Each structure stands twice: as structure tokens, then as C-alpha cells.
Design a protein around this ligand. Structure first.
Ligand SMILES: [Zn+2]
Lengths: 148, 1096, 136, 50, 49, 99
DNA sequence: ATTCGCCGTGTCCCTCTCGCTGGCCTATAGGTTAGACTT
RNA sequence: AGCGAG
DNA sequence: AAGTCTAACCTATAGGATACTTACAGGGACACGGCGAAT
């Protein structure tokens, strides 16, 4: 009964509403615009991008290689391997660490993925929406002002 | 006493007991360990004194362990030997100036040998520029100064821990074997009588499989154990038969997916545990397990890896512990008690010092070296290779370069004092690589385990999120070669306290029975009181018969670090206030006088001398030439030496590092004498602050809730004033559009602003500069849209002062610079920052407070003869803070300032009976000392106060109670009741307001989100976080919140429009939609979540 | 400001290509020397927008009067520099891929919808076992 | 059956279903925890940010 | 600790008694440090409910 | 001119952590010499502040609606009672009690 | 052997805020691009 | 990585 | 000065032939799965 109730919730979510489940499997993946994905030189003119560029680049690399491979015509083993690579890379892109291994850039640091910008404190919600730095402001140490 | 320092001031002491051992070389923990790493001859001599059997340094160790490298074939081999160090390439000062890393080239004899035919190839290979510890124990990396903080870790070994399960209320004992870079392995005894074999943390296994895997037959197991019910139960219920079957099961479990085979199984087991390639529990670990199990006699240790006998010893010990035997007598080994070790205890928590840390880094670098060379031998043909070809330094040096920079222990040297520098050394950092972290650090690992007594500072720890994780070494503490922290002890042998200072570890100290440091020794080594306070094995404190005692502490204050040991009257301060005071003694800024404290302890001298600031006579001699720049001394035999002085050198935290000579041309200097003062020293003693005349009354509320009132005298006379030196640097680079060049030819600008610049375009030395002024003119190739725009280094907002000095580096001078940098300029601007209201002051008792108001000298309380009080403290902070030690401090300080004379009309007063001679009389301003835990008793202090010599006339300002009659300087009538006045030592803390204040009206904005930046280094705002937003919602203030989150910070169109409205005076427009919300929307959309908006 | 609803929901591939102003093909970010975004790269101006206000790749358009016009040789729409912050890209996958959240998040919504199990789904999607689409 | 629904809409649904075929759903009060109460809200922004 | 301390801060604690008092001081500080975070989280949950 | 354009222009004083509603209070600013925000001692208990190095933040409300909110809703003198239980917070404490 | 009811174990999201300081080797066709004269 | 306020 | 007119440079593609074959905390909570009575 309990399993039926849970699965009924999941399916009736689609059934009652007009949202069909076909949108769960992705044929095209969106690309967050560039300024939310910076690429800026700094210090001695050394360019310093973000981590999403690496993840997007990995997805693109896997995709181009897969397209070529299908076009040339290869045994099912290699095309399956490339599809698996694309899958795990899209997973890392959308959510790094959620599956497989955390894709770690140089220094064995898990690269920030699009999901990471939501979870925890450092995410968007708790850091830049529910509290923001403000102009026309200042601070200093305080002292007792008894003549006030 | 004598002080044993050829130039120390005759600071009298209240000490009622003698110190059998003078304080060690407080920087011993660093210098001795690093010299062990290097293998210096002095370390060799010390080892010969203390273990001549096995004298071998750290580098020799890592080389021997690595060597001989062998390929899989084994037809050729490689080896290393004889690590030698050359002289340092550049002197310490030179490297600090020109950014060079003070280091020595390292050379090693590499030997490549062919085994198939027999050949040798000997070479002297260059293994990098090994950084070298300076004389003061600080490394110099890239000019900067850094300190490697000693780390604390859990010693590799065997740990039997017992836990009570609530499911059935039963005690189960589990062992845990910690190797150094090995594989984990646990034995558990669960609810049932099943002995676990969890290997690599995998789903539990029975015991019989492992024993059979090791070749132990069922008959062998049964006959070796004919008593233990649990294990016969396990044998019957193991439901597995055959060593081959056991290996099959082990391989299947440990190697899922692999087709099992018996030879592979045995080889894999041996490789995983017994072969010395992946299981290398270090010499410390082997020592620990041998002691815990008593397998071997105290023979030299070379079989670091584990052994079958060892694991069977652990199994039998564990099962017998479950049975509950008192002691275990292992087969063919020394018997030892059956006890459960505790992780926090210092008998099992080792001090991994600088030597071991750099050794580990070298070991990993050399391991990667070994990997790459073993790879190389396959590609290269034999007979066509030379040790030069085999060795590629890139791993090793990288490790070193990656360790000193960018590490959790190569901490940036913090020196705004000498004490801060000293105490940064001798610091035990429980957190770091291979250690615990803040998230996993519970309350259990942070407490003060009763074994800390003498091996750590129970009082001195940070207050932030590090309480107990970062302690300091005790004064007398010493480090065993194994990394344990020894403490000295005096051995009493049947009521005769002897003089053999024997160093004990935690375990040995627990074995014996140790008495307190202060006890009634009857001038002959015997005790008076029948029973004395005494420590037992687990830290318990009791009374024990006097004849039983066999160990006594060397002296009280053995259980306090350098910092805490300088707090006079520490025996009256609650531990929290003492903790805070010991913390802030590391924060006091160095003033321009630095008067010696009027009341202190014995540590004011040694600390200073060990800090290394004061120039010390290398050899005894006669002074010849004295000058502010340098001192030249005639040595006793012909030769001479010149000591060059660092004047106005910047400190790592912006304070000045002046050194001032204190000798004249004719003086004879003895070896080890103090020749020149440091930043905070005064004739050798540590002078962190000033003796100020303090009253303890609440004065008109200005000293309300910890606030401190100051006399304007301290500003007029310049009692408190620091010289904060800053460092501003700019570099001209080469770009595609052209080459940057600093010069006076700035773009359109008035002639009023080039006055300061000299012909080079940089500010003339000595020219005052203020906010908005130009330091180094610079014009940046403008290219396509003058051929150059404006990019001159302007001093940041709020800064000012004189230009101390200008340093220049030019490509034409063939000087080292980053690629593309035509020139580099460093400008020093120094400000003589005065004392200002809002700044923090504090004593040596954590009696902190800001300067609420600096009254004029006239309208302050004054004594009978018109002496204004230089400071006032609130009275409602002494009692509840439980730090009345400061009150006794200021009482003794008044007694020291005025001078006293005990009248021996009828013998000597009884209260002064214990008082030593030379304290019955003392001239005014006679500096004294009250050691930490034995010192000026209350009765002695009262008696001292009862007879103080009149200052000028027949008038004793302070009565016997320590309280005087203060005349209100604001109104004139006397305060109707007395006031507690005295001389208290207080210091200026490095929290000055000029570095704190900040405002913003429109500054830089981030680019991912258009919110304002954050930080004083930029303009930045102030984070209106979430709790503030809850406050605003609670008030109901909606428009204020809206504009605090929309137009002030985020609405990209809103900011310019509201600024325009304010400037032109129109109404403030309506806020829009936060940009950061748009960014959230775009991110969600880029996450394939169709998040749409509509209002209809 | 006229807000009433945030009706989040599953985004079908049709919507993904509906948002996209172009399609990034190659993983090329910025030129080695001239420091300019490539064509059909992850930053290509034609896809997202001009990196400089009132300019285009070949640069023949610089005035503001002909705003809202896309060049010929390089095909960059002449708009504000800030429009890059909003215009969004997309990439066409050669083979379909599963959204990580719905597949792996516990409980697996995909598995519950399709009556399948978590480890089983991990096996099929990551190419470890086959599944029958249908049979007559 | 067993899904948590706020009291007001529960009563409204009971009243509505009583009309046009009476099958009045009979529920029972439940004591939720604070965190679950925060999550089981009618707005997904607050729950998302919580 | 069943000793217990018998010396007043005015009279001046001996060495072992100070070492004993240190346990209480340190545990109080650590408890405060952690309880502040626990209180903050509870406050956030209450505000959100 | 500054001394004139500041009169009757409230500013919000805040002290992190803002544990309760009283953490933020609007005060009329008056010019002071030195470098430290002078704080009326009575409000200390509201802020939980003790002058031992505490730092506090000043925010400026701009819009006429915001300035009205500062003057009426959040002014210091309009908030003498704790929202918790009505116990006054801006009452003589510590030194004043002894006096 | 399946049903249903219990236990049992494994894998995962959360525990205050606000400041400050420092730190390989070519070969070739086609695309692309530098410089210069001019009316 | 270190530190200040609670 | 853009509009030609002239003269380079630079880079995606491609091409060369001993041999070499398996890397490198803790806590609460829920969901996926042991152990036992019943049909
Ligand atoms: Zn164009």
C-alpha cells in the first residue's frame, strides 16, 4: 500500500497537470549566458574563468566526438562508451558529485556545477537574495556617549 | 636570584623556592628538529649523547628507505647516499630584501648499478634549493618570513576501545590499527560472540577466515586457545573450512569482479599487509605496538611493517580484554597490563614537528621521483643511461615549493611583537593535513586531558573557532625523537628530593606518582606535612604518604606557555580571563618608548632573549665604535665584529622593527649579553606597554561597560604611540598597445599635483602624502578608442604619512622581475599613529576596553599633591570577571613606584619572615618580579603596602588599604570616599580605529551579481544579511527593507537614477526588480527548469 | 514590475531550443592573441551578444543610430553590451541524456514513474544492461 | 489517504464534495514538526530557499 | 572532581587546583561556541515556520 | 554645510548578530570628532553591546518613505520595551543602578 | 514459494552572524592578414 | 591560514 | 582615407611504418532489503 501511495503521488503529479514526463529526458542542454559564466583577465593579464566553462567544454567535447563517431560508423562498444561519457559529463555539469566521482579540476578540487550555485550557504538563495551588501553604509568601533 | 644573563637588570623577585633547571632554549623545538632533518654535526653529537647506536638524520632516512630502486625485472638498480648541503647562496638580509628564498643547494651521491653484468655509475646530483631554517627559527620564502607550526596527530599503533551498547547493555571491545600510509583494519566483538575482521571497511567477516588465511590450522587455533568461549564459538560458527577456501572468500570480498585464484590471493594479502610497499607503519608505530604488546625486547627496530605474530598478538589481547584479564603474557614477549588506551591522552598523541613535516613532503616527492624513473628505465636502453638521465627533480622541488607556499602549517609569520613571533613557534596546531578538522572536532578532542600538565598550555588557546585545537608548548617541555612531548622531573628517593632532571613522557609520568611543585621541602629534600597533593595515573588528585612519592615537578609554572607565564598574579585570575590576557599579550603594538613593566615575572628576560630581536654578543669583547646604524666590537683576541642594525624595518603586520644600541664605546661586553633593544624590549626585559597611574572608580559613566578613560597627558607626552609602516607597490608592464613607463608626463593634470614627484615620477623621499595624492606616476598605453591613459598609484583612502623609502627594480638593471614587467617600485609610507578614542587598550589580565574619552589633563582626578591619574577603569568589571589579579598587580605596582622600607626595629615583622632579603628595602621605581604560581602572597603585599616611603614630603598618599584620597578635577571637592589607585601595566592592542572605520556611498560592484563589493581594502558596503532582514520585517518597515535590498545594492538601473535624483534633489524613484533575482532566474532556466512569470 | 506567478515545471527540449538565441558548436572561448571570442564558440557574439556596446565582430557598425541591426560578414546583432547577461545558449546532444536530478535524487522519480528500481535504472541508463522498449 | 492537507482547504473540500454526491472525507489532526511544516507550504520559493 | 578546590582566588590557587579549574573554563567556552550555532539554526527554523 | 544637511536625518545602527527585533535602531546622527560611533549607553542592553571592541554598522535610509520609517517606527526613543515579554531594556543598568 | 509483518543496514542533507589581515616533426591548400598607392 | 565581537 | 592594390603569414587538415596488449564527524531519516508465522 505505501509503495503504491508513493508511486501514485509521483505519477499523478504528471497526470493531474498538463506537464507530460517526456521533458525529463534531454535532447538539448541549455547554456547559461556568458556573464553568469565569467571569462576575465586579472593580475598580470592572466585570464581567470569559472568552473562551468570546463564542464560545458567537457560536454561539448564528448558531444562532438560522439557525433563524429556515429557519422564514421563504429562498433557498438565505442559508441556506448562515448554515450556513457556524455551522460556522466552532463550529470557533472548539472550536478557535480551527485553521481560517479566529483569531477575535480587541478588541485583535486570538485568543480562547481550549476546545482552547486543553489545548495548550502554559498548558493544564490542564502547569500545574494536573502541578504545583500548595501551602498550608503559604513561601520566602526563604538564608544559610550553619556552626554548624548 | 642571579638571572645568569651578563646584562640583565637586578629585578628583585618574591620567589620562595629555587629553580633546579633554568628555562631551555625556547626555540629548541624548531632548531633541534630542523637540524635533525639536516643532519648537522651538533645534532650528531646530541644523538651520540642520547642514542649513539643509531645516529641517522631525516634526509638519510628518506634516502635509505627509498633506496635501492628496482624495476620489475630487477636486472638494474638505483640508490642514493651521502646527502650534503652547500653554503647558503645569499645572506639572510639580502634574501629578505631582493625576494630571494634563503636556501642552500642540496647534493646527493646517486649510484646506478647494473645487475645483469655489474657496473656502477656514481654522480653528484643536484636535488633542488632546499630552504634553510634561519638562526631565529623562521624560514624566508620569497622574501616573506614564514613559520612551520608543529602539528599534533594520533600516533600510529594499536587502540583498544570499549563501548557500552544500549541495545542489551553490554560492553564490547574493538581494536583499531592505525598505520602510516597503510590499509585500515579493525577487529570487533558484536552482540554475538563473533570476532570481526573488517578490512578496508567492508561488511564484517568472521575471525577463522583470517587465521586460516595466515596458515593457522584449526588445530593450531584450538590448541593455542583452550579457554576462551567466544573464539571457540566463532570457530564452530565460522561456517568456513580450508585455508584455500578462506583465501577464496577473502579474495572474492576484497576483489569483487576478479576471478579468484589462490596464488593471487596469498600474494595480494601479503602485499596489502606484510610486504613493505603499501603497509609501512613507521618506527613510531612499531615502537608503540611493541610496547602495547611486548612482542620484542627493547632491541633496535627495523621491521617497520606488520607481522603475523603481531596480528595474532592483537587478537589474543583483544579477546583476553573482553574476558577482563589484568595482564597479558604474550608468547615469547614481555608481559604488559591489559588496558584500553584513550585517543586524547598525550601518550598516544604525537607532535609532528617541522622536521617530520618537511621529511614527509620530501618522501612523497621522492616517491613520485621513483615512479617516474622506474617508468623511464623501461623506455631507455641499458648501457645508454647515466644517473643524470635517471633523475628528474621536478617532483621533489615542486613538493617543497608546494609545501612552503600554499599549506596549512607553513603559516605566514605573525610578528607585531617579539612575543607573537616567539609564541607562533612552539605552537601545537591539532588541525591540518592528515589531522582532524573543525567540522569533525567535537568537545571531547578540545578539552584539557589531565595528561597535558607540563606538555601543553592549559590556559593559552584562541577564542575563535579553534578553542583547544591550537595550543602552545610549555616552557620546560621537550620533544622526544619519536615526537612525544617530554617534561622534566626531579626524582625523590625516600624523602630526599634529588637533582637529576629526568625527562618523562606521558606514559612514564602516568606509571609513577608525581607530587606538586610547591611543597614543604625542609631544606634537605624531605617533606614536612605527612601527606601532600599528588597526581596519579589517570590525572586523579589525592593525598599520598610522603615516603611513597618518587617524583616531583622541577618547579611551578611548568604548566604554562611563554605567554601565560608573564602574567603576574596568575594564581588569582579565573582561567578565562587569564586565557584572554595570554592571547592579547601577542597583540600589543610596539610603542616608541617601551618602558619595562614595573611588575612582572622571571620570563620578561629569557623570552626577549629567545625571541632573537635583541642583538646578543656572539663572543665576549670590548666595544670600539657605537652608532645607530651599527656597532663594532673589539674581540678579546685581535679580531673584531660589526653588528648591523635594522632601523625602521617593516614588520609582517605593519609595525616598526627599530633596534637601538644600549652600549657605549668603552664598555666591555660579555658573551651572551644584550647589546641592543628590539621592538618591545627595554634593556633586555620584555616591555610590551607602559606603567600608567590607574584609578578604579566609575567616573561620570565615560568608563561604562568596559570603556577606559585616558588622560590627555598620554597624548601630549607621547606615552602611547605606534609607528605603523605600510607598503604600496606598482609595476609598469609591457602590453600589446605599447610599453608602460612611469614618468612625470602624466595626462592632463594640474601642476599642483606633480610637486611631490621627483624626476623619476615617483614621490620624493620624505615628502608627506595624504589621501588622493600621487606616489608613482604611471600612464597606460591608450591605443585605439594621448597614446596613454592614466593609471598612477594613488594612496588609498584614509591613509597618510611620510615616505620612509623607495625601492626600484628595473629591467635595464638586469634585475629579476616577472615576465613583461619593465619596472617595479615599492613605496613605504609610515604614520606615527597616536592614541585615539575608540582604540582598544588592555592589561595583562584580559581587562580590555576601548578609549571612551581622552579627558584634558586638568579635569581628571588627582591625588593629594596634584598628580593626575593617567587612566580610569570601571569598577564593575573586576568582581564578576573574577580577575582581581589586576588589583593586586596595581597594588604591588604602587609599592614598586613609591618604594618601601620594612622597619627592623624589633627583629623583622612576622609577615615578612618568608620575604627574602633585598626586598625589605627598595628605591622608588624598583622593578620587581612575582613569579607565576609562587609569588607575592596576600600577607606580604599587605605588609609591603603598610610601609611605603613618602614621595617628596611627609605624606603617604596611599593608606594601608591601597586606596587614596582623589580630588575631583572637574569640580574640586574631594571624592567623599577613597579610591583604589595604583600603577598598572597596560599595552596598546593592534585594533586601532584608523584601520576599522569605513563608509561607502558608491564604490566598485561585483560582476557576476551587481551587488556591492565587501571589504575595507576595497570600498565595499556592509552585509545586510538575513537576521537583519528578519529584524526589518519584524518592525514592519517595508519600504526601508525594499530600498535596502533593491536600489541600494542590486537594481542596476535604480542606482544611477536614485543618485541623480538625490544630486538634483528630485524625489527618489520606485525600486525595480533585483538583478540577482534575474540571475537566479537565468540559472534556473539554464538548469532545464522552465521557470516562467506572468501577472494576468 | 508586474509579477504574480512562478510556475516552475519540466522544460522540454523544444523549450530549450526556444529560449536559445543560437547554438554553440565548438568549445572555443577566446582567441589566443586578439582576445576575441570565437565564432560558434562558448562566447560567440552572434549567439549571446556583442561583448562591446554598439559594435560587431568585424566592427563596420559603431554608431547608435542603426541599433537593432545584425551585421553581414560576422552576423552580430548591434545591441547593448549587457544583453549578453540575458540571452541564453544551447547545445544539441547527438544522443539523448537523462537529467541527473530526477534519475538519482532519492526517491528516484524516474524509477517510481516507470516502476523500476534505483540500481536497475543506474544499470540501464549508464550502459550496463539492456531494456525492452516494447513487444507485440 | 494519509496525505497532509491544511485544515481550511480540507473543510472546503469536504463541503464541496458533500454537494453533488456525498462522500465526506473524514480526517484526523496531525502534529507536524517545524521543519516539515516549513517544507510543506503552498509556495515553492520559501521551501526552496529554506 | 572530588578533591575539590579549597583555595579562594583571593588567597591564590595552587598549581593543580588551577589545572583542575581549566577543565571547567575550557568546556564552558566550547559549549558556548557550539550552542550559539545551535541557537541560530533554531531561530532560523522558527522564523521560517 | 555637512552639519546642516545631516540634521533630522535618521540612520540605522545595527550590530551583528541581530538576535532580536531591537538589534536595528534608528538614531538621529550628530557630528562627533574622533573615529568611533558614540552610542548612548542606555541602548546597550538592546544591542547586547559592550564597549570592548564591538563594531557596529550605520545604514542610511534615503527615500521619504524610508526616512519616515526610520523616524516613526524604528526610532530609539519609541522602543523602550522588549518585544519578548515587555520588560524594559532602555532602563538604568549596571553603573546607573549602583549610582 | 508468495504474503505480510517485523527487524536490520546503508546512503545521504543539515547544525549563528558580521567584520579584518595576509598569501614528435614536417607538407600542403586554403583562410587570413601585414603593408602601400591613391584622387 | 590567522584574528576581533558576541 | 576607404578603396583598392600588393604582398605575405598562418593554420586546419594530412602524413610517417622494429617493438610494445587490463589504470591510479554525527544524527535523523528513509529506502533497500534479513528473519519468522501463515496460507
Ligand atoms: Zn560586422
Amino acid at each position: 500500500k505505501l509503495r503504491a501511495l508513493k508511486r501514485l503521488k509521483v505519477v499523478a503529479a504528471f497526470q493531474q497537470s498538463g506537464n507530460s514526463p517526456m521533458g525529463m529526458v534531454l535532447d538539448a542542454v541549455p547554456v547559461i549566458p556568458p556573464e553568469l559564466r565569467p571569462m576575465v583577465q586579472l593580475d598580470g593579464g592572466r585570464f581567470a574563468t569559472s568552473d562551468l566553462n570546463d564542464l560545458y567544454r567537457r560536454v561539448i567535447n564528448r558531444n562532438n566526438r560522439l557525433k563524429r563517431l556515429i557519422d564514421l560508423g563504429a562498433p557498438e562498444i565505442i559508441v556506448n562508451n562515448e554515450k556513457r561519457m556524455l551522460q556522466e559529463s552532463v550529470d557533472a555539469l548539472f550536478d557535480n558529485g551527485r553521481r560517479g566521482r566529483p569531477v575535480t579540476g587541478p588541485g583535486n578540487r570538485p568543480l562547481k556545477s550549476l546545482s552547486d550555485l543553489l545548495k548550502g550557504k554559498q548558493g544564490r538563495f542564502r547569500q545574494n537574495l536573502l541578504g545583500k551588501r548595501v551602498d550608503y553604509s559604513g561601520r566602526s568601533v563604538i564608544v559610550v556617549g553619556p552626554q548624548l | 636570584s642571579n638571572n645568569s644573563v651578563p646584562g640583565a637588570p637586578n629585578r628583585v623577585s618574591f620567589a620562595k623556592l629555587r629553580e633546579p633547571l633554568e628555562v631551555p632554549g625556547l626555540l629548541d623545538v624548531q632548531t633541534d628538529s630542523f637540524e635533525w632533518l639536516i643532519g648537522s654535526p651538533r645534532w650528531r653529537e646530541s644523538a651520540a649523547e642520547r642514542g649513539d647506536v643509531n645516529p641517522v638524520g631525516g634526509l638519510e632516512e628518506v634516502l635509505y628507505e627509498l633506496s635501492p630502486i628496482e624495476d620489475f625485472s630487477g636486472s638494474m638498480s638505483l640508490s642514493f647516499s651521502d646527502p650534503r648541503f652547500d653554503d647558503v647562496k645569499a645572506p639572510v638580509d639580502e634574501c629578505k630584501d631582493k625576494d630571494m628564498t634563503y636556501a642552500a643547494p642540496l647534493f646527493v651521491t646517486a649510484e646506478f648499478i647494473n645487475n645483469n653484468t655489474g657496473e656502477i655509475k656514481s654522480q653528484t646530483v643536484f636535488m633542488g634549493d632546499f630552504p634553510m631554517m634561519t638562526e631565529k627559527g623562521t624560514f624566508i620564502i620569497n622574501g616573506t618570513e614564514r613559520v612551520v607550526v608543529s602539528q599534533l596527530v594520533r600516533s600510529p599503533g594499536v587502540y583498544f576501545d570499549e563501548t557500552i551498547d544500549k541495545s542489551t547493555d553490554k560492553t564490547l571491545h574493538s581494536v583499531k590499527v592505525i598505520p602510516s600510509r597503510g590499509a585500515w583494519l579493525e577487529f570487533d566483538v558484536d552482540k554475538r560472540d563473533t570476532v570481526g575482521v573488517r578490512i578496508d571497511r567492508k561488511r564484517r567477516q568472521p575471525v577463522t577466515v583470517l587465521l586460516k588465511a595466515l596458515g593457522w590450522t584449526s588445530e593450531q587455533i584450538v590448541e593455542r586457545f583452550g579457554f576462551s568461549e567466544i573464539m571457540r564459538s566463532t570457530l564452530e560458527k565460522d561456517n568456513t573450512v580450508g585455508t584455500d577456501e578462506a583465501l577464496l572468500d577473502i579474495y572474492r570480498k576484497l576483489r569483487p569482479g576478479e576471478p579468484p585464484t589462490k596464488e593471487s590471493a596469498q600474494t595480494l594479502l601479503e602485499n596489502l599487509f606484510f610486504k613493505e610497499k603499501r603497509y609501512d607503519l613507521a618506527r613510531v608505530g612499531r615502537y608503540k605496538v611493541n610496547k602495547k604488546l611486548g612482542l620484542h625486547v627493547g632491541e633496535p627496530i627495523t621491521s617497520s611493517t606488520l607481522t603475523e605474530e603481531d596480528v595474532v598478538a592483537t587478537i589474543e589481547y583483544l579477546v583476553r580484554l573482553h574476558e577482563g584479564q589484568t595482564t597479558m603474557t604474550v608468547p615469547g614477549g614481555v608481559e604488559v597490563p591489559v588496558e584500553t588506551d584513550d585517543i586524547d591522552h598525550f601518550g598516544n598523541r604525537r607532535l609532528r614537528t617541522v622536521g617530520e613535516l618537511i621529511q614527509n613532503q620530501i618522501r612523497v616527492g621522492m616517491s613520485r621521483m621513483e615512479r617516474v624513473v622506474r617508468e623511464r628505465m623501461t623506455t631507455q636502453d641499458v648501457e645508454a643511461i647515466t644517473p643524470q638521465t635517471l633523475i628528474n627533480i621536478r617532483p621533489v622541488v615542486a613538493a617543497i615549493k608546494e609545501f612552503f607556499g600554499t599549506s596549512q602549517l607553513s603559516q605566514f609569520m605573525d610578528q607585531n611583537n617579539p612575543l607573537s613571533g616567539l609564541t607562533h613557534k612552539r605552537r601545537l596546531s591539532a588541525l591540518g593535513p592528515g589531522g582532524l578538522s573543525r567540522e569533525r572536532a567535537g568537545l571531547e578532542v578540545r578539552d584539557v586531558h589531565p595528561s597535558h600538565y607540563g606538555r601543553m598550555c592549559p590556559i593559552e588557546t584562541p577564542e575563535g573557532p579553534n578553542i583547544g585545537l591550537i595550543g602552545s608548548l610549555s616552557v620546560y617541555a621537550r620533544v622526544n625523537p619519536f615526537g612525544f612531548i617530554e617534561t622534566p622531573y626531579r626524582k625523590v628517593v625516600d624523602g630526599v628530593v634529588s637533582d637529576e632532571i629526568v625527562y618523562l613522557t606521558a606514559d612514564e609520568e602516568d606509571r609513577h606518582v608525581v607530587a606538586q611543585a610547591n611543597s614543604p621541602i625542609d631544606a634537605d629534600g624531605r617533606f614536612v606535612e605527612p601527606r601532600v597533593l599528588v597526581r596519579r595515573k589517570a590525572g586523579e588528585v589525592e593525598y599520598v604518604p610522603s615516603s611513597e612519592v618518587d617524583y616531583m615537578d622541577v618547579s611551578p609554572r611548568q604548566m604554562v606557555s611563554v605567554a601565560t607565564a608573564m602574567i603576574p598574579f596568575l594564581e588569582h585570575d579565573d582561567a578565562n580571563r587569564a586565557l584572554m590576557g595570554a592571547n592579547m599579550q601577542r597583540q600589543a603594538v610596539p610603542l616608541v618608548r617601551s618602558e619595562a613593566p614595573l611588575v612582572g615575572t622571571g620570563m620578561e628576560l629569557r623570552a626577549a632573549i629567545d625571541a632573537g630581536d635583541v642583538v646578543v654578543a656572539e663572543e665576549s669583547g670590548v666595544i670600539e665604535e657605537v652608532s645607530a646604524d651599527y656597532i663594532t666590537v673589539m674581540h678579546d683576541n685581535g679580531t673584531r665584529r660589526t653588528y648591523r642594525m635594522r632601523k625602521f624595518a617593516r614588520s609582517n603586520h605593519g609595525t616598526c622593527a627599530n633596534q637601538c644600541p644600549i652600549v657605549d664605546a668603552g664598555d666591555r661586553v660579555e658573551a651572551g649579553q644584550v647589546i641592543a633593544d628590539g621592538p618591545c624590549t627595554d634593556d633586555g626585559e620584555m616591555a610590551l606597554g607602559k606603567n600608567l597611574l590607574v584609578a578604579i572608580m566609575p567616573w561620570e559613566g565615560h568608563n561604562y561597560e568596559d570603556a577606559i578613560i585616558l588622560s590627555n597627558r598620554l597624548v601630549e607626552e607621547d606615552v602611547l604611540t605606534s609607528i605603523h609602516i605600510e607598503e604600496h607597490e606598482i609595476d609598469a608592464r609591457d602590453t600589446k598597445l605599447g610599453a608602460e613607463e612611469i614618468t612625470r608626463d602624466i595626462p592632463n593634470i594640474s601642476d599642483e599635483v606633480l610637486a611631490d614627484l621627483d624626476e623619476r615620477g615617483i614621490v620624493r623621499i620624505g615628502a608627506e602624502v595624504r589621501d588622493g595624492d600621487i606616489l608613482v606616476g604611471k600612464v597606460t598605453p591608450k591605443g585605439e578608442t594621448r597614446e596613454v591613459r592614466d593609471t598612477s598609484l594613488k594612496v588609498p583612502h584614509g591613509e597618510s604619512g611620510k615616505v620612509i623609502g623607495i625601492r626600484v627594480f628595473s629591467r635595464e638593471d638586469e634585475d629579476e622581475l616577472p615576465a613583461g614587467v619593465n619596472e617595479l617600485v615599492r613605496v613605504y609610507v609610515a604614520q606615527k599613529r597616536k592614541i585615539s578614542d575608540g582604540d582598544k587598550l588592555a592589561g595583562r589580565h584580559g581587562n580590555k576596553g576601548v578609549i571612551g574619552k581622552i579627558l584634558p589633563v586638568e579635569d581628571m582626578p588627582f591625588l593629594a599633591d596634584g598628580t593626575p591619574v593617567d587612566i580610569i577603569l570601571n569598577t564593575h568589571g573586576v568582581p564578576r570577571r573574577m580577575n582581581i589579579g589586576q588589583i593586586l598587580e596595581t597594588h604591588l605596582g604602587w609599592c614598586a613606584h613609591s618604594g618601601w622600607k620594612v622597619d627592623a626595629a624589633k627583629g623583622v615583622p612576622d609577615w615578612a619572615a618568608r620575604l627574602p632579603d633585598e626586598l625589605l628595602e627598595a628605591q622608588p621605581n624598583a622593578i620587581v618580579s612575582t613569579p607565576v604560581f609562587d609569588g607575592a602572597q596576600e600577607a606580604e603585599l599587605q605588609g609591603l603596602l603598610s610601609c611605603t616611603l613618602p614621595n617628596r614630603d611627609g605624606d603617604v598618599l596611599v593608606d594601608a588599604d591601597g586606596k587614596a584620597m582623589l580630588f575631583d578635577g572637574r569640580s574640586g571637592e574631594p571624592f567623599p570616599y577613597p579610591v583604589t589607585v595604583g600603577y598598572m601595566y597596560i599595552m596598546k592592542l593592534h585594533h586601532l580605529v584608523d584601520d576599522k572605520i569605513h563608509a561607502r556611498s558608491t564604490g566598485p560592484y561585483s560582476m557576476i551579481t551587481q551587488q556591492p563589493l565587501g571589504g575595507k581594502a576595497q570600498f565595499g558596503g556592509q552585509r545586510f544579511g538575513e537576521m537583519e532582514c528578519w529584524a526589518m520585517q519584524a518592525y514592519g518597515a517595508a519600504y526601508t527593507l525594499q530600498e535596502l535590498l533593491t536600489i541600494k545594492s542590486d537594481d542596476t538601473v535604480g542606482r544611477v537614477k536614485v543618485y541623480e535624483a538625490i544630486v538634483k534633489g528630485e524625489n527618489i524613484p520606485e525600486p525595480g526588480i533585483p538583478e540577482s533575482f534575474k540571475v537566479l532566474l537565468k540559472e534556473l532556466q539554464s538548469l532545464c527548469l522552465n521557470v516562467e512569470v506572468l501577472s494576468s | 514590475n508586474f509579477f504574480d506567478e512562478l510556475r516552475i515545471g519540466l522544460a522540454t527540449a523544444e523549450d530549450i531550443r526556444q529560449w536559445s538565441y543560437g547554438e554553440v558548436k565548438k568549445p572555443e572561448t577566446i582567441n589566443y592573441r586578439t582576445l576575441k571570442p570565437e565564432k560558434d564558440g562558448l562566447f560567440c557574439e552572434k549567439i549571446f551578444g556583442p561583448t562591446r556596446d554598439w559594435e560587431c565582430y568585424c566592427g563596420k557598425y559603431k554608431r547608435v543610430r542603426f541599433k537593432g541591426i545584425i551585421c553581414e560578414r560576422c552576423g552580430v546583432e548591434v545591441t547593448r553590451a549587457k544583453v549578453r547577461r540575458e540571452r541564453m545558449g544551447h547545445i544539441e546532444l547527438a544522443a539523448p541524456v537523462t537529467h541527473i536530478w530526477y534519475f538519482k535524487g532519492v526517491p528516484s522519480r524516474l524509477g517510481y514513474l516507470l516502476d523500476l528500481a534505483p540500481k536497475d535504472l543506474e544499470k540501464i541508463i549508464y550502459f550496463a544492461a539492456y531494456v525492452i522498449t516494447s513487444v507485440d | 489517504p494519509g496525505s497532509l492537507i491544511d485544515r481550511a482547504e480540507f473543510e472546503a473540500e469536504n463541503r464541496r464534495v458533500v454537494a453533488e454526491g456525498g462522500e465526506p472525507a473524514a480526517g484526523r489532526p496531525v502534529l507536524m514538526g517545524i521543519t516539515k511544516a516549513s517544507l510543506a507550504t503552498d509556495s515553492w520559493l520559501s521551501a526552496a530557499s529554506f | 572532581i572530588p578533591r575539590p578546590v579549597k583555595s579562594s582566588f583571593r588567597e591564590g590557587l595552587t598549581v593543580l587546583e588551577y589545572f583542575i579549574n581549566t577543565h571547567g573554563a575550557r568546556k564552558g567556552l566550547a559549549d558556548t561556541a557550539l550552542r550559539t550555532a545551535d541557537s541560530g539554526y533554531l531561530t532560523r527554523r522558527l522564523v521560517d515556520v | 554645510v555637512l552639519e546642516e544637511v545631516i540634521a533630522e536625518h535618521p540612520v540605522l545602527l545595527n550590530r551583528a548578530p541581530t538576535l532580536h527585533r531591537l538589534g536595528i535602531q534608528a538614531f538621529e546622527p550628530m557630528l562627533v570628532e574622533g573615529k568611533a560611533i558614540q552610542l548612548h549607553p542606555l541602548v546597550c542592553e538592546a544591542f547586547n553591546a559592550d564597549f570592548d571592541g564591538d563594531q557596529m554598522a550605520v545604514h542610511l535610509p534615503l527615500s521619504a518613505e524610508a526616512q519616515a520609517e526610520a523616524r516613526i517606527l524604528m526610532l530609539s526613543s519609541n522602543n523602550i520595551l522588549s518585544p519578548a515579554s515587555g520588560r524594559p531594556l532602555a532602563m538604568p543598568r549596571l553603573d546607573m543602578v549602583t549610582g
